[PDB]
Amino acid sequence: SHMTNLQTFELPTEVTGCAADISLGRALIQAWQKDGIFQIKTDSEQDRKTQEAMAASKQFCKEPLTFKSSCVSDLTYSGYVASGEEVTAGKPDFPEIFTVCKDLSVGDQRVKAGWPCHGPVPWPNNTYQKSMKTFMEELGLAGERLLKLTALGFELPINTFTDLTRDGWHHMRVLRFPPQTSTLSRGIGAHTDYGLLVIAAQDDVGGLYIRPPVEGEKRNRNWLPGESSAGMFEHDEPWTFVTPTPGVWTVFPGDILQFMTGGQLLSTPHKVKLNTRERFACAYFHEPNFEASAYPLFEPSANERIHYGEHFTNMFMRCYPDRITTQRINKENRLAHLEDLKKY
Question: At which positions is Fe cation bound?
Answer without folding.
Answer: 191, 270
